Design a protein around this ligand. Structure first.
Ligand SMILES: [Mg+2]
Ligand SMILES: [Mg+2]
Ligand SMILES: [Mg+2]
Ligand SMILES: [Mg+2]
Ligand SMILES: [Mg+2]
Ligand SMILES: [Mg+2]
Ligand SMILES: [Mg+2]
Ligand SMILES: [Mg+2]
Ligand SMILES: [Mg+2]
Ligand SMILES: [Mg+2]
Ligand SMILES: [Mg+2]
Ligand SMILES: [Mg+2]
Ligand SMILES: [Mg+2]
Ligand SMILES: [Mg+2]
Ligand SMILES: [Mg+2]
Ligand SMILES: [Mg+2]
Ligand SMILES: [Mg+2]
Ligand SMILES: [Mg+2]
Ligand SMILES: [Mg+2]
Ligand SMILES: [Mg+2]
Ligand SMILES: [Mg+2]
Ligand SMILES: [Mg+2]
Ligand SMILES: [Mg+2]
Ligand SMILES: [Mg+2]
Ligand SMILES: [Mg+2]
Ligand SMILES: [Mg+2]
Ligand SMILES: [Mg+2]
Ligand SMILES: [Mg+2]
Ligand SMILES: [Mg+2]
Ligand SMILES: [Mg+2]
Ligand SMILES: [Mg+2]
Ligand SMILES: [Mg+2]
Ligand SMILES: [Mg+2]
Ligand SMILES: [Mg+2]
Ligand SMILES: [Mg+2]
Ligand SMILES: [Mg+2]
Ligand SMILES: [Mg+2]
Ligand SMILES: [Mg+2]
Ligand SMILES: [Mg+2]
Ligand SMILES: [Mg+2]
Ligand SMILES: [Mg+2]
Ligand SMILES: [Zn+2]
Lengths: 138, 150, 99, 124, 208
RNA sequence: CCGAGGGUAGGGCCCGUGACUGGGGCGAAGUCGUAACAAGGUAGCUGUACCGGAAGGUGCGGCUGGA
RNA sequence: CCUGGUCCACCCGUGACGCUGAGGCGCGAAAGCGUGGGGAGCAAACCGGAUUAGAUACCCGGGUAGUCCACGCCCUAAACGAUGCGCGCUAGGUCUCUGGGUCUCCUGGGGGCCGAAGCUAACGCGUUAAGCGCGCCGCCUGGGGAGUACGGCCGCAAGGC
RNA sequence: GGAGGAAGAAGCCCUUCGGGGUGUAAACUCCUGAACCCGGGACGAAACCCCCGACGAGGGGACUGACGGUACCGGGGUAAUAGCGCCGGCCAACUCCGUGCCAGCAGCCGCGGUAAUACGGAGGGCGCGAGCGUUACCCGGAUUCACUGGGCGUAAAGGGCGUGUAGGCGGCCUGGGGCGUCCCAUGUGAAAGACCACGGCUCAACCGUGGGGGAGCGUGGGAUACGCUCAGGCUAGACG
RNA sequence: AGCUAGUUGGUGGGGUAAUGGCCCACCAAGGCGACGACGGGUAGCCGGUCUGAGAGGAUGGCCGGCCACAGGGGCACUGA
């Protein structure tokens, strides 16, 4: 019955990439989209589009991996190395603007809901706000 | 030719009717000090020989440590089986704080300012192995957004 | 500011007085997660106007009797016995905790 | 344990046992010798260790170790007690401080003497 | 404090040489020039490869032993820097150098450091007017470290001020050799200092 | 009137101690057997029951961590 | 005869009515206990016969509770997958049980074996996860002392928690 | 105490009887003068009080020091206390002799049974210094109570199995509230300590001045993504 | 692991600088507890202090703020 759909989505992705799949349809949702948007607007994906599997609306989300490789295990590197939910359904995590994390020393991002749209670390810190830390991606 | 410092050497042994035969082990690091290092493990019927083989594989397998100010790009954690290692970058003028294993490996790799913590299994061997894969997985703002092209 | 609180009347069996059950929330000092916790306040009701099951606002009033330092401010919503049912059950479950 | 579980049960603080009830969190304790005997080592050792049961001030009583070589401790000798065990004589868990009360220092000893309470001798 | 006893003996041990002596350590007889081996019955023996500790220690020890300072103060000083902002490497020395008994060595006024001290101590030295006898006294930027009027007339301040005439001196100092009185221009920069010691290692020995 | 406490009486908890008694821990090289580890020389372990100087045995069902 | 769960098909009805679950309650192998039946075979105990240094055993001939039924207790276990339950996601190969279809094929539930990726200290796991995640419950914190002691609750007891 | 001082005294310790070591250390030589001797000697003390003005605003005058003849300044001036810990490994420092599971060491692993760097003395060495060691206790290392930051197939660890009470957790969209949550302003958060700068005592310790911060909590305003709550709709969970 | 008789509330009084079951009469039968009541153990509390990368853990001596006490215990008097 999916306790937390978001943490699901993230995992849907996390599992996809692990074997380098084209796209993956996580059931649709305005908030998921909002999140997804920032994966594309920030470039962890080609992007996403609305779809349907019998009146039932998922989201086609096209991954994005690195260049093939020399040596053994020629499998490419990944754009999304590590994605994991922060605030959880059983331990909501909130932060003032000063507390906001600095993911992977500037190299990564920390998506996070707020009273004025789903920002990110830089995005909120600059916008001058805080809110529910949603997850960390890099 | 690079630096080549010797981490640890041990005498192991096996059994056989009459007594116990032997063997020695050599875990060795290597690095000019420009961002290049290689770990190599060498087993052989004698101390010196083993230490030799050390450097040989050492040079064989080496890695591009993307320095910066003499420290490191980002903070990372890696588990190698039961042994886990934390590498966190420090400001110029701090020191290379670590155990003999991770420090040795870290010196010849260049670094001068790095914070390190040795969690999990502290098996010398395995810590080494761990330290490498850490570096191996180091990124710079460059090769970062180099993957977020499109 | 004379503190105020909002809670249900969970007992109306006193002369001119009601037990108002009152809930509050907060983040846990080390394990984060918001946690629920409540108290009970004994509330002056000089017109016995307030009946059982009513959600109400209370206010930090002058000491009326021992154990009794709050007056019933004003009604918030009549008919809410569903919350009362939660109280009374929690209480009834106690019988099954002794020897 | 789920977060919730910690909000309920919560983690339990360790707390350790005082390896030495020398009493009121005391540096040392004074006492008198009830017995002065000579016990024998454990697992793979062998010898005759000089030990004394002491009647402490705290109505107590414990077997204590006598450091060094030779001594002067009899059935009524006073003494001060230090407290470290002896991985060898099950029983003894305190040491006698040499050079206080009826406890002579170590005779003719010249090396480390803080331990063993011998005065610094003149060279002449 | 300040050790006191056999010195061309750590001049030994440390390997690297030092001039806790001044003149004679220039002789072809520093005992160092003669016995390039550390003291004691052994010295001349197949020396075992030091432990990573052994190194870090020896280094710091070496350095410490140079300014002939107490492990306490050396430590207090180390921390003094550690606390202060910036690269502790340099700063530990910046203050190591501000010591009046060191400034009155480097500013030539004396031959050995262990003589400079005794000088400052006996008050023979001075500062911006008022005399001083505080070896530890940390010299800041812009300070007149003269000699004492009573002390200009000393054979030894003389023979020390002797060869000093014209002899070039630190790029963070100055020496009006005529009027026997130098100034402290600034806080050194790593390079300005030349000493046989990897500052890092010390930093590391106090992170043990 | 209440009231420090004192007295009488009966309960509750905790500490110390007690002929004697139960097992338990440790102790370089004691007496008795051989139970287990190799098919351990009757596969082992197991809950329960009964029995025996002791390990243990046997019954009943069970597990393979046995064949 | 009475009755539980469960799978499939049709997309019909309700409209989130869900997941979990401290305590509570119910069930819970064998042995064991109570009252009353029953009793062929088997068989703790027990008796012999052998073996043996001895043989309170193994093997042999006997043999009583018990093993069976009714009602009531007892509540343990290598109560084992030594793997809590629910949901989503992450290659397939093979044979097997049982449903449904314009049935050399396809799909749904279930029981197995080899195995991607991944996990793993290793052995091994692997869409029946020990992978990747979320929820909620239970549990561990060096060995022996000891599942002992005390207290408590339960039980006829044995004993259990 | 500082500078010089042997291819390097004697004594003592090793020794492959050539030698090696303490060691520039000592002696010795000059210069410096802790101490002590003589002199001079405070800040801390300007008010209360008096005169004029008005007993006021303002002006002037005078008394008072426990420490104390102490600090501090000047002159003379003697080479003038060193001790403790360790040197098997962690962990730095090694050789002789004595000893012989004895005497003893001991935080752990362990050492001692006739050639002991592990006991005991010695020589030497490492370490610190008016201290060095020891015992006791607190935190650390211990990521070994694990929020940060751990685990349960066999290492300790899944409840013998269900049912379900409280509780924890909650699918898709729309709207209202704005409780959590987020931002701004304001009050508060004493001083001392702490941290950053600057000066006072010859430095420092101490000590003065200034600045900058502090979660929390009260108050006023604002935001509405996620959580909550009320209201409306849906069918992918669940039920029939 | 259950607690409670001034116990919870009420009316009227007494009392105080003033609220109040603080106290006294009469009335009703309530009040509290697994969010841990009651009971036992231990402890003065804080600004701070020690330690720690930090989150924490330990701690409350000197100094400052508050409380408590003055051989053990009770009492009231004078009085802002
Ligand atoms: Mg692991
Ligand atoms: Mg022995
Ligand atoms: Mg009485
Ligand atoms: Mg057997
Ligand atoms: Mg056997
Ligand atoms: Mg057998
Ligand atoms: Mg049996
Ligand atoms: Mg039998
Ligand atoms: Mg409908
Ligand atoms: Mg259930
Ligand atoms: Mg049963
Ligand atoms: Mg049965
Ligand atoms: Mg029966
Ligand atoms: Mg038979
Ligand atoms: Mg028969
Ligand atoms: Mg089974
Ligand atoms: Mg369960
Ligand atoms: Mg199947
Ligand atoms: Mg398989
Ligand atoms: Mg499959
Ligand atoms: Mg124990
Ligand atoms: Mg047990
Ligand atoms: Mg039992
Ligand atoms: Mg009992
Ligand atoms: Mg060593
Ligand atoms: Mg000793
Ligand atoms: Mg010795
Ligand atoms: Mg450490
Ligand atoms: Mg901790
Ligand atoms: Mg955790
Ligand atoms: Mg663990
Ligand atoms: Mg186990
Ligand atoms: Mg199970
Ligand atoms: Mg179990
Ligand atoms: Mg529920
Ligand atoms: Mg709000
Ligand atoms: Mg303050
Ligand atoms: Mg009362
Ligand atoms: Mg007390
Ligand atoms: Mg820590
Ligand atoms: Mg009194
Ligand atoms: Zn020299």
């Amino acid at each position: 019955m999916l306790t937390d759909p978001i943490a699901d989505m993230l995992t849907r992705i996390r599992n996809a990439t692990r074997v380098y799949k084209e796209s993956t349809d996580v059931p649709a949702s305005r908030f998921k989209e909002e999140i997804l948007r920032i994966l594309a607007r920030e470039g962890f994906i080609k992007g996403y589009e609305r779809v349907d599997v019998d009146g039932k609306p998922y989201l086609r989300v096209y991954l994005k991996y690195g260049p093939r490789r020399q040596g053994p295990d020629p499998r490419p590197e990944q754009v999304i190395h590590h994605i994991r939910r922060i605030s959880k359904p059983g331990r909501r995590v909130y932060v003032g603007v000063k507390e906001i994390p600095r993911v992977r020393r500037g190299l990564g991002i920390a998506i996070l809901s707020t009273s004025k749209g789903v920002l990110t670390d830089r995005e909120a810190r600059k916008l001058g706000v805080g809110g529910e830390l949603i997850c960390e991606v890099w | 030719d690079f630096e080549e410092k010797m981490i640890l050497i041990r005498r192991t042994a096996r059994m056989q009717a009459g007594g116990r035969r032997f063997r020695f082990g050599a875990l060795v690091v290597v690095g000019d000090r420009q961002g290049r290092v290689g770990l190599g493990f060498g087993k052989a019927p004698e101390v010196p020989l083993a230490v030799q083989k050390a450097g040989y594989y050492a040079r064989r397998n080496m890695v591009e440590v993307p320095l910066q100010n003499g420290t490191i790009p980002h903070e990372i954690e890696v588990e190698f089986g039961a042994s886990k290692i934390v590498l966190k970058p420090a400001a110029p003028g701090t020191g290379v704080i670590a155990g003999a294993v991770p420090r040795a490996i870290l010196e010849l790799a260049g670094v001068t300012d790095i914070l390190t913590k040795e969690l999990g299994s502290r098996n010398p061997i395995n810590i080494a192995y761990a330290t490498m894969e850490a570096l191996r997985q180091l990124r710079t703002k460059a090769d970062v957004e180099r993957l977020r092209k499109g | 500011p004379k503190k105020v609180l909002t809670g249900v009347v969970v007992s109306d069996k006193m002369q001119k007085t009601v037990t108002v059950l009152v809930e509050r929330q907060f983040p846990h000092p080390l394990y984060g997660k918001v946690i629920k916790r409540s108290k009970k306040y004994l509330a002056h009701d000089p017109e016995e106007k307030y009946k059982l099951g009513d959600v109400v606002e209370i206010i930090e009033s002058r000491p009326i009797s021992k154990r009794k330092r709050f007056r019933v401010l004003r009604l918030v919503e009549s008919g809410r016995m569903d919350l009362v049912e939660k109280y009374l059950i929690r209480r009834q479950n106690y019988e099954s905790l002794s020897k | 344990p789920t977060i919730n579980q910690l909000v309920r049960k919560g983690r339990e603080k360790v707390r350790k046992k005082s390896k030495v009830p020398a009493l009121k969190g005391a540096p040392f304790r004074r006492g008198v010798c009830t017995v002065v005997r000579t016990v024998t080592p454990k697992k793979p050792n062998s010898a005759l260790r000089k030990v004394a049961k002491v009647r402490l001030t705290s109505g107590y009583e414990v077997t204590a170790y006598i450091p060094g070589e030779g001594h002067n401790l009899q059935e009524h000798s006073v003494v001060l007690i230090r407290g470290g065990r002896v991985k060898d004589l099950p029983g003894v868990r305190y040491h006698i401080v040499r050079g206080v009360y009826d406890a002579a220092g170590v005779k003719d000893r010249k090396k480390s003497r803080s331990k063993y309470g011998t005065k610094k001798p003149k060279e002449a | 404090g300040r050790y006191i006893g056999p010195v061309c003996r750590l001049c030994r041990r440390e390997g690297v040489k030092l001039y806790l002596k001044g003149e004679r350590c220039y002789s072809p007889k520093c005992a160092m020039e003669r016995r390039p081996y550390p003291p004691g019955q052994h010295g001349q023996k197949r020396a075992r490869r030091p432990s990573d500790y052994a190194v870090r220690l020896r280094e710091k020890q070496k350095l410490r032993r140079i300014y002939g300072i107490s492990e306490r103060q050396f430590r207090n000083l180390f921390e003094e820097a550690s606390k202060k902002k910036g690269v502790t490497g340099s700063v530990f020395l910046g203050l190591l150098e501000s010591r009046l008994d060191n400034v009155v060595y480097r500013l030539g006024f004396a031959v050995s450091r262990r003589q400079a001290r005794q000088l400052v101590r006996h008050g023979h030295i001075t500062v911006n007017g008022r005399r001083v006898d505080l070896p530890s006294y940390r010299v800041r930027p812009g300070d007149e470290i003269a000699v004492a009027e009573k002390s200009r007339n000393l054979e030894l301040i003389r023979q020390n001020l002797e060869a000093m005439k014209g002899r070039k001196v630190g790029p963070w100092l100055s020496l009006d050799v005529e009027g026997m009185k130098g100034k402290f221009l600034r806080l050194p920069d790593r390079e300005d200092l030349a000493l046989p010691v990897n500052e890092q290692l010390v930093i590391e020995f106090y992170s043990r």
